[PDB]
């Protein structure tokens, strides 16, 4: 029970969408950042039983991850590269609200994020 249900990676009910900015959060963007050798924290929904960390979700109420970001674009579960670009945001957001400035994970963070920046920085016109 210290788990909650991981974020839904699909859903009928909302439309799905698929545009050349959404192509390449997936290819450029999400597949390169996976690859960096900070990603391994960010690559599941936090695991606050195996991690030891019980009052993870007590103070993170909107969970995110990049296995997540990656199977709802494998999905075409976004609208828009807004929406996908806002997931990312709020993984990063999460780890510095949980975590303190200078911590291992949230200087792993912080150089995650500057790459993503870089990559978004400039994407493809439809
Ligand atoms: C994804 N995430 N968000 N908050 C976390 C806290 C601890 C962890 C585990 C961890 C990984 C790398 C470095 C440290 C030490 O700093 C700890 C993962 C977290």
């Given at each position: 029970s210290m788990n909650p249900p991981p974020?839904?990676?699909?859903?009928?009910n909302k439309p799905k969408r698929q545009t050349n900015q959404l192509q390449y959060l997936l290819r450029v963007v999400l597949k390169t950042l996976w690859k960096?050798?900070?990603?391994w924290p960010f690559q599941?929904?936090?695991?606050a039983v195996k991690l030891n960390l019980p009052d993870y979700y007590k103070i993170i109420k909107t969970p995110m991850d990049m296995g997540t970001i990656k199977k709802r674009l494998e999905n075409n579960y976004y609208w828009n590269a807004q929406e996908c670009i806002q997931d990312f945001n709020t993984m990063f957001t999460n780890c510095y609200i949980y975590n303190k400035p200078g911590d291992d994970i949230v200087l792993m963070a912080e150089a995650l994020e500057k790459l993503f920046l870089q990559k978004i920085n400039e994407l493809p016109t439809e």
């Open positions: 974020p839904e990676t699909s859903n009928p960096h050798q900070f990603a599941q929904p936090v695991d």
